[PDB]
Amino acid sequence: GLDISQATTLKATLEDVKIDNGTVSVDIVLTNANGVPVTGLEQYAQINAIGLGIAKLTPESGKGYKTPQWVSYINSVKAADPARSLANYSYTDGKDSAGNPITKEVKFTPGDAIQANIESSCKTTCLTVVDSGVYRYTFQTNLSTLPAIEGLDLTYDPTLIHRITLELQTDGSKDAKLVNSHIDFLPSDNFRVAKETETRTVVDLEANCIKCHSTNYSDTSSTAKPLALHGGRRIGIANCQVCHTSYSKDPETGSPLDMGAMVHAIHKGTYAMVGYSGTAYDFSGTMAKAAAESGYPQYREGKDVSERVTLPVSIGNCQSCHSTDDKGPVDAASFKHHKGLACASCHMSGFNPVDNSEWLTPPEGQKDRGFVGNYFHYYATPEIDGIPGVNLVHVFQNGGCASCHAEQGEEGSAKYHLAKANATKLLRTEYAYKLENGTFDVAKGELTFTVNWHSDVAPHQDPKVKEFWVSLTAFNGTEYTMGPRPSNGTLGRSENRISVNLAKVETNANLTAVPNGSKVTYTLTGIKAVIGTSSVPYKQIVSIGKGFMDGKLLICANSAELDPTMDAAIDCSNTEAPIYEVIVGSNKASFSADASNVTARSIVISEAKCANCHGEKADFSASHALTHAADKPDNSCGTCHSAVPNTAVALADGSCVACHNGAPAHSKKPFERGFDFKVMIHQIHADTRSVRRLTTDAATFPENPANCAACHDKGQLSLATLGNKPAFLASTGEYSPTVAACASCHATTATDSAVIGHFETNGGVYNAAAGTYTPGSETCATCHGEGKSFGVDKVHPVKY
Ligand code: HEC
Ligand code: HEC
Ligand code: HEC
Ligand code: HEC
Ligand code: HEC
Ligand code: HEC
Ligand code: HEC
Ligand code: HEC
Ligand code: HEC
Ligand code: HEC
Ligand code: HEC
Ligand SMILES: O=C(O)CN(CC(=O)O)CC(=O)O
Ligand SMILES: O=C(O)CN(CC(=O)O)CC(=O)O
Ligand SMILES: O=C(O)CN(CC(=O)O)CC(=O)O
Ligand SMILES: O=C(O)CN(CC(=O)O)CC(=O)O
Ligand SMILES: [Ca+2]
Ligand SMILES: [Fe+3]
Ligand SMILES: [Fe+3]
Ligand SMILES: [Fe+3]
Ligand SMILES: [Fe+3]
Ligand SMILES: [Mg+2]
Ligand SMILES: [Mg+2]
Ligand SMILES: [O]
Ligand SMILES: [O]
Numbered sequence: 116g117l118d119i120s121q122a123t124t125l126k127a128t129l130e131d132v133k134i135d136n137g138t139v140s141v142d143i144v145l146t147n148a149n150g151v152p153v154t155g156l157e158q159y160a161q162i163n164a165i166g167l168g169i170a171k172l173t174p175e176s177g178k179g180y181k182t183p184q185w186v187s188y189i190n191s192v193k194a195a196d197p198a199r200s201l202a203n204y205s206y207t208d209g210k211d212s213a214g215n216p217i218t219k220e221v222k223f224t225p226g227d228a229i230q231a232n233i234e235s236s237c238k239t240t241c242l243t244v245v246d247s248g249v250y251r252y253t254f255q256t257n258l259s260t261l262p263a264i265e266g267l268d269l270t271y272d273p274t275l276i277h278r279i280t281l282e283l284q285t286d287g288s289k290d291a292k293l294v295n296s297h298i299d300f301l302p303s304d305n306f307r308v309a310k311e312t313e314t315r316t317v318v319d320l321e322a323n324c325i326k327c328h329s330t331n332y333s334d335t336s337s338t339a340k341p342l343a344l345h346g347g348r349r350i351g352i353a354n355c356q357v358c359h360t361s362y363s364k365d366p367e368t369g370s371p372l373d374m375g376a377m378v379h380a381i382h383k384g385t386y387a388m389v390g391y392s393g394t395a396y397d398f399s400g401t402m403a404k405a406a407a408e409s410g411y412p413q414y415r416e417g418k419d420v421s422e423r424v425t426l427p428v429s430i431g432n433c434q435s436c437h438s439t440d441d442k443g444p445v446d447a448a449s450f451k452h453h454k455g456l457a458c459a460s461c462h463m464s465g466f467n468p469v470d471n472s473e474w475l476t477p478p479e480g481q482k483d484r485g486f487v488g489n490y491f492h493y494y495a496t497p498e499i500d501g502i503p504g505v506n507l508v509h510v511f512q513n514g515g516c517a518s519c520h521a522e523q524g525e526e527g528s529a530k531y532h533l534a535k536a537n538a539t540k541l542l543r544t545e546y547a548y549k550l551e552n553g554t555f556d557v558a559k560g561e562l563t564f565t566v567n568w569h570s571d572v573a574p575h576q577d578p579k580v581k582e583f584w585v586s587l588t589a590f591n592g593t594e595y596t597m598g599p600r601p602s603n604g605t606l607g608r609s610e611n612r613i614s615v616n617l618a619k620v621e622t623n624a625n626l627t628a629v630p631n632g633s634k635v636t637y638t639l640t641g642i643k644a645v646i647g648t649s650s651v652p653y654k655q656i657v658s659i660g661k662g663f664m665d666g667k668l669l670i671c672a673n674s675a676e677l678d679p680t681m682d683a684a685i686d687c688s689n690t691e692a693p694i695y696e697v698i699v700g701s702n703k704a705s706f707s708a709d710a711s712n713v714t715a716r717s718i719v720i721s722e723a724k725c726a727n728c729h730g731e732k733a734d735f736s737a738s739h740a741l742t743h744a745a746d747k748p749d750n751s752c753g754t755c756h757s758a759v760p761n762t763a764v765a766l767a768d769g770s771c772v773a774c775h776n777g778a779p780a781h782s783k784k785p786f787e788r789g790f791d792f793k794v795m796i797h798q799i800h801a802d803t804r805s806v807r808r809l810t811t812d813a814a815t816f817p818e819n820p821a822n823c824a825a826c827h828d829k830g831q832l833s834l835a836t837l838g839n840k841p842a843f844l845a846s847t848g849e850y851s852p853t854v855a856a857c858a859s860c861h862a863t864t865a866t867d868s869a870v871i872g873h874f875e876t877n878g879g880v881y882n883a884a885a886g887t888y889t890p891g892s893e894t895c896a897t898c899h900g901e902g903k904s905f906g907v908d909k910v911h912p913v914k915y
Contacts, residue, residue, distance in 0.1 A: 116152030116247040119159050124148040124291045127283055129298035132306045137259030137271065139169060141279050141298070145248040152248030157239050159285065164348055165242075166282040167252055168233030168357040171275045172299075172315050173268075175454075179520030179527070182449045183315055184361050185278070187231035188271075189256055190264055195366035199393040200225035201413060206405040221387070221401060222470045224369030229264060231360045233280065252281075267362065273302040276309050280354045289343070290333035295351030311445045320352050322443035323436050326727040327427070327817040329914075336912040338801075338821045345391075361456055365389060369467060371456055378436075379460035384424040385501070397421035400812055423812040427728040430461065431502070433532050435730065451529040453519050455487040458528075463490055464501035491519065530677055535695060538683035542670050542697045543732075545569060545684075550585065550664050553706030557660045560643040562587065562706060564664065565636040566617070573628060573635050574618045574668070579684040581669040581696060584748065586614040586762045587706055588773040589655035590662040590713060594840045595772050596655070597755070600780040604652025605641050607754040609780075611655040611662075612773060614748035614762045615639055661713045665770050666701030667762050698734055700764030715768075719831045722767035727825075728817070735771075736761040741808040755780065776843075777855070783846035786882065787863035789855070791843040796826075797859035805863065820860070823907060824915045832907050834900045838878070838893030848882035853895040 119125075124147050131142040145153045156162070169188050175181040201223045207216045234241075237255045245251045258271045280297040299309035318324070320342075328342040332350060343350045359374035367389035371377060380386035380398070387397040395402065395414065400423030406414040414421060428435050438447035450457075459466075468475055468486045474494045477483045484492050495507035510518050510531070521527030546569050553564035566585075568574065574583040588595065589611045598610035606625060607613045617637060620628040625641045644657040656662065673685040674693040685694055705713040726733070739758035746753025748762045755774060763770040775792035784790055787805040788798065798804035801820035802813040818825045823832065834853060842849040850858065854874045858881065865871045865882065874881050878892040901908045908915075 116154040119153050119155045122147050122153045127294040127296050137257040140251050140253040143250045157242045161286050163284040165238045166233045166235040168280040170278045170357045180523045190231045193230050193366045194227050195225045199389045200367050204405040224467050224469050225367050228364035228366040230363045231358045276314050280357050284348050289347050295354045297353040316444035317449045319444045322438050329818045331914050334912050338819050340819050373456045376456040376460040382426050383430045385464045395419040398424045425815050428730045451521050451527045459487045462501045534677050539697045543699050546699050550701050550704035552704050552710040554710040555706045562639045565634050568633050571632050573630050575620045578686045580618050581671050581687045582616045583618040584614050584667045584762050587664045588612045588662045589659040591659050595776040596778040597774050597780050599650035601650040601652050603751045608751050609754045661707035664704045668699040670697040672697050720767045720826050721828045724826050725766045777841045785847050786845045789845050793856050794859040801860045803863050821911045823911050824913045829915050832901050834896035839890045842888040851879045851888045851893050853893045854879040
């Protein structure tokens with residue numbers, strides 16, 4: 116075999132478990148990546164950790180099925196550190212309806228607490244070499260001799276599935292010589308290995324977490340952000356689960372460490388605890404807020420972390436983390452079954468049994484169901500719930516018990532949790548439509564196009580259709596340009612874009628609709644512009660005469676319809692029922708003088724990649740809430756500013772770039788918060804945007820932003836034609852296209868004149884007077900295109 120001092124990689128497998136009079140040993144088969152046995156561990160002077168944990172999977176019971184939970188045999192009661200036992204605080208946030216400031220309160224329950232843990236300190240003392248690269252670890256901890264801990268049943272039970280975990284790290288290695296392994300087994304059947312269906316998994320790193328998280332553990336770059344915890348040494352889910360048990364808490368706050376409770380609260384932006392070395396980790400951002408507003412001496416800028424997690428899906432999007440397609444963990448359906456801490460971790464944010472001790476007692480003549488039970492059964496309200504508007508007590512009283520208490524194979528609360536997502540899918544499928552190409556008679560000012568609609572009840576005849584926008588945008592074959600803001604026009608107030616609501620034919624004097632069974636042919640008139648040096652409505656649509664048409668249909672759905680065999684679509688004017696909107700996009704059709712295709716804009720990012728984090732078909736109307744958000748997109752300022760809706764759907768086909776391009780109209784922003792699509796999206800996700808319109812909180816991007824493959828596919832960054840695009844004209848000056856693309860991270864201001872000179876040396880312009888750059892001048896591609904001398908794929912920590 117090979118000496119560990121010379122091994123560049125380690126792998127480790129666990130086997131041959133023995134437990135005898137409470138004495139636990141296990142074999143660690145140590146190899147290199149190539150499978151060569153690695154010798155010399157037991158004497159190696161560069162070992163950072165050898166940590167071995169052991170746990171049993173214990174059953175739970177109550178009404179319905181409850182999933183089994185892990186109990187570590189190794190635990191201890193931690194005292195709180197008094198100086199780091201967090202005080203309660205309050206902070207201002209918004210205003211009530213009368214215009215007075217709302218105060219919010221954050222409350223903690225410091226006090227001693229149990230923490231599960233592993234055996235860490237023994238290391239090589241506990242090892243005996245049994246073979247080449249085979250080391251027997253014999254725990255120092257005896258199962259017969261565990262100190263009693265009040266409330267915990269530590270009794271050894273061979274009939275229960277057990278787990279042992281290993282964390283092994285040498286040479287300070289982030290990856291190559293880091294291992295997390297585990298083995299699950301049934302001691303009472305001769306310590307055989309557990310079947311997938313016998314043990315507890317629930318989530319799987321690959322099926323459930325990597326859609327957002329980097330696992331590039333060896334990432335050496337400055338912006339590295341891999342999902343490795345506790346100094347870098349813990350990376351495997353199975354390892355977390357042995358410490359992060361239902362009964363473990365942080366003594367300094369009272370916060371739960373239970374895996375589900377902690378993970379739900381982190382991604383909801385409510386979790387706060389004090390960790391190693393007394394560092395406070397506040398995932399809400401509110402601690403720093405209160406410090407700045409009121410004073411909060413326990414928050415120490417630069418040491419404690421107080422940042423609001425910005426999750427790119429709703430916290431209600433369970434399928435982001437829990438598999439429903441039977442390609443995840445075999446016990447993925449665990450998320451359908453009630454578990455106090457899990458249910459509480461969203462619905463009871465900020466509540467605890469001290470500050471809300473009333474809930475410890477059920478109402479006169481009701482059964483006591485515990486703190487969380489009583490909340491769900493008795494005390495919850497829409498005003499106080501961790502999910503505003505949710506009415507659990509209404510479900511308890513009116514929805515029957517099976518709404519939350521599920522037998523195996525039933526849906527429980529998933530019936531409610533998945534209802535809008537499921538109906539949304541069905542409705543998109545049922546109302547799917549196609550836009551055929553438009554014929555634009557430009558002298559006549561008239562656009563004709565046919566929609567292939569799902570039925571012979573047309574959009575304007577279907578009261579379940581809220582609106583049906585079709586937007587057309589001029590495209591000159593090179594790149595979209597929004598252009599100056601004109602005076603208002605009948606159809607819109609943009610040079611390059613018109614949005615028309617087809618659901619309102621009868622009241623629109625410019626629109627006529629002619630049904631032919633399921634096909635509806637529309638004719639839009641009044642598309643006329645005097646073409647001059649002046650900005651006028653439809654100026655580009657008229658001078659270019661061709662471009663693309665995109666559909667955004669809004670269907671009203673019934674939030675009270677929970678049964679997927681029923682029709683979830685509902686009359687938009689209905690008053691009984693809470694209604695939500697389902698968005699249905701379309702193909703991107705062309706319009707042109709004869710309705711022939713307009714060659715597609717180049718695709719330079721991947722739709723499926725933005726969906727990894729944002730979910731499929733993410734809507735960004737709410738991103739348009741700052742400025743003139745209530746103006747409709749067929750009406751003056753709303754043409755560009757609307758959030759009701761924003762009229763774009765797809766992310767990677769240029770629909771956003773129709774506006775977000777090199778030529779923002781007016782009230783322009785400077786480069787460091789620029790409007791142009793690549794520049795805006797780079798800056799948001801790299802945290803180089805000087806100001807975000809709708810929040811003071813930087814995005815918490817869960818990948819490395821310098822991992823270009825997070826959004827770009829291999830081949831999309833040749834940069835071959837990029838220099839032929841028009842410059843981005845920001846408030847102060849213009850930036851050539853490759854310069855804008857790169858400087859959106861590398862130079863959002865002229866702070867390093869060397870980097871700015873590099874641009875200018877090689878045909879680029881940076882914050883130059885308008886008109887300076889000539890398309891074709893940038894020579895960037897020759898060195899920075901993928902695969903070149905300094906190719907973007909070579910200089911950046913990419914993971915294709
Ligand atoms: C066209 C105007 C461009 C633009 C926009 C950029 N380059 Fe280059 N580049 C080259 C070399 C050898 C380096 C140094 C590499 C290293 O030190 O590891 C660079 C550097 C850059 C950067 C990074 C700057 C920073 O420190 O932030 C950026 C953003 C960049 N370049 C952009 C090589 C070349 C060329 C070789 C002939 C060509 C041509 C270009 N670069 C052109 C451009
Ligand atoms: C969600 C809105 C619920 C509804 C509807 C019902 N129950 Fe429930 N119950 C719920 C929670 C979140 C808890 C706490 C579980 C925990 O681990 O703390 C409970 C608790 C109970 C219990 C205790 C036993 C258990 O299964 O944990 C019982 C016996 C119980 N609830 C009964 C019950 C009945 C009879 C219901 C219909 C009348 C009912 N629950 C509805 C959540 C919800
Ligand atoms: C996008 C929808 C995500 C999915 C799916 C998962 N996580 Fe996540 N996580 C996400 C964000 C935006 C953040 C904050 C930014 C960051 O990466 O730090 C997090 C954070 C965490 C953390 C805290 C990391 C740290 O700051 O200490 C943990 C421990 C974590 N996420 C775990 C986790 C697990 C186990 C997931 C699969 C079940 C998972 N995340 C999915 C976004 C997203
Ligand atoms: C026991 C050896 C642990 C294993 C394995 C993992 N975690 Fe852990 N974690 C553990 C404890 C006892 C604590 C609280 C410490 C305290 O001072 O009270 C934590 C804390 C966290 C946190 C909060 C942030 C922090 O303190 O760094 C997170 C986000 C967390 N743990 C995540 C986590 C993950 C995802 C793990 C598997 C890869 C994991 N931990 C393993 C104990 C242990
Ligand atoms: C990633 C950020 C998550 C999203 C979004 C949701 N869940 Fe989750 N959940 C997540 C993890 C990592 C865990 C812990 C797994 C473990 O080892 O303990 C859970 C757990 C739950 C549970 C408990 C399951 C059990 O212990 O058997 C429940 C009941 C649960 N989750 C429900 C749930 C719902 C309904 C969600 C959408 C509204 C949801 N989770 C989102 C990670 C994440
Ligand atoms: C965050 C990850 C959640 C966890 C964990 C649990 N719930 Fe939940 N719940 C969540 C959201 C975002 C919503 C609203 C869903 C919607 O479409 O708007 C809900 C809703 C419910 C409901 C229905 C409430 C109502 O219609 O008024 C119930 C009955 C419910 N949740 C119960 C419940 C149970 C019992 C949980 C543990 C299994 C649980 N939730 C966890 C978010 C999250
Ligand atoms: C996970 C690694 C992501 C990938 C891949 C993509 N996005 Fe993203 N985005 C992510 C986070 C954590 C956030 C912060 C969310 C918040 O609520 O603040 C964002 C934000 C955006 C935004 C801004 C939304 C807003 O400020 O109104 C946009 C427009 C956006 N993301 C778009 C987008 C596109 C087009 C992507 C593929 C090219 C893409 N994102 C990928 C996380 C991640
Ligand atoms: C013109 C009809 C637009 C299209 C199509 C899209 N956006 Fe937009 N966006 C537009 C304007 C006029 C504004 C200014 C602010 C306002 O409230 O009107 C914006 C702004 C954004 C932002 C702001 C981000 C920030 O500055 O930090 C985001 C995140 C955003 N837009 C995203 C976005 C996406 C993802 C689009 C395609 C789905 C999209 N916009 C299209 C005008 C228009
Ligand atoms: C598209 C042709 C536009 C129409 C019509 C109107 N506005 Fe606009 N506005 C537009 C853009 C692209 C931007 C952002 C510029 C950038 O470089 O980021 C704006 C900005 C504003 C602002 C500043 C606040 C902001 O969100 O940046 C205001 C106050 C504003 N716009 C107002 C406004 C009014 C009153 C309009 C009708 C009279 C109007 N806009 C139309 C693009 C377009
Ligand atoms: C998602 C959060 C992204 C990350 C990570 C990176 N880029 Fe990107 N890029 C992103 C968007 C949404 C766009 C505009 C897409 C469109 O349809 O126009 C871009 C564009 C580019 C470009 C211009 C490519 C071209 O038009 O020929 C370049 C040169 C570019 N991006 C470079 C790049 C690099 C080197 C990255 C890793 C360090 C990288 N991007 C990350 C979104 C995202
Ligand atoms: C944010 C999404 C980025 C964009 C877009 C581009 N780059 Fe980048 N780059 C970024 C980071 C965070 C780093 C540091 C990575 C590290 O290893 O620590 C880099 C690095 C470079 C380098 C290496 C030389 C250096 O100056 O560090 C080069 C040569 C480089 N980047 C080039 C470059 C070009 C030409 C871009 C436009 C096509 C570009 N980058 C975009 C982040 C981001
Ligand atoms: O396909 C589904 O059933 C669910 N969708 C929505 C959609 O396709 O409209 C997201 C997804 O596939 O994860
Ligand atoms: O459903 C499809 O056929 C393809 N998808 C993504 C996917 O599910 O992988 C795009 C979408 O549904 O919008
Ligand atoms: O286009 C305009 O309306 C003129 N501008 C440019 C800009 O809005 O950034 C400033 C102005 O109103 O005089
Ligand atoms: O452009 C507008 O319509 C309003 N203005 C000033 C103005 O030019 O009158 C503020 C702004 O654009 O930020
Ligand atoms: Ca602590
Ligand atoms: Fe889908
Ligand atoms: Fe799909
Ligand atoms: Fe102006
Ligand atoms: Fe103005
Ligand atoms: Mg009409
Ligand atoms: Mg707006
Ligand atoms: O899908
Ligand atoms: O403006």
